[PDB]
Amino acid sequence: IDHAKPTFRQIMAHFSDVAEAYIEKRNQDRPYMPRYGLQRNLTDMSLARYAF
Amino acid sequence: PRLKSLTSKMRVPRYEKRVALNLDHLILYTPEQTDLSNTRSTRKQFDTWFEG
RNA sequence: UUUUU
RNA sequence: UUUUU
Numbered sequence A: 001i002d003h004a005k006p007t008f009r010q011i012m013a014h015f016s017d018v019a020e021a022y023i024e025k026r027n028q029d030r031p032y033m034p035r036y037g038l039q040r041n042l043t044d045m046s047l048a049r050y051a052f
Numbered sequence B: 001p002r003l004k005s006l007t008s009k010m011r012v013p014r015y016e017k018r019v020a021l022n023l024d025h026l027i028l029y030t031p032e033q034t035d036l037s038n039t040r041s042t043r044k045q046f047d048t049w050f051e052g
Numbered sequence C, D: 001u002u003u004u005u
Helices: A017-029 A046-050 B043-051
Strands: none
Touching: A017 A046
């Protein structure tokens, strides 16, 4: 963290589609939802795709 | 005198000209209708419930 | 543009 | 597609 010139989001913006397909698979097996919506109260199990 | 249902002179899409895409060996594909839908879930899920 | 624990 | 106590 102390060794990037812009911020952390501004570097991790690459790693988008890899975890996308990740959650597609392991959601297709089982009803996973991440954290970030469960604090914010999403509704649709389908829309885990973008609770980043 | 006899013949088949499907044809070749039919109006069909074409990647390039000679290519015919809906390959006409699909005479034998009629699974159950509801078995294909989304309104019924999948066999894997049906297994993992039965195992959990 | 930043600021979402 | 969800939402039928």
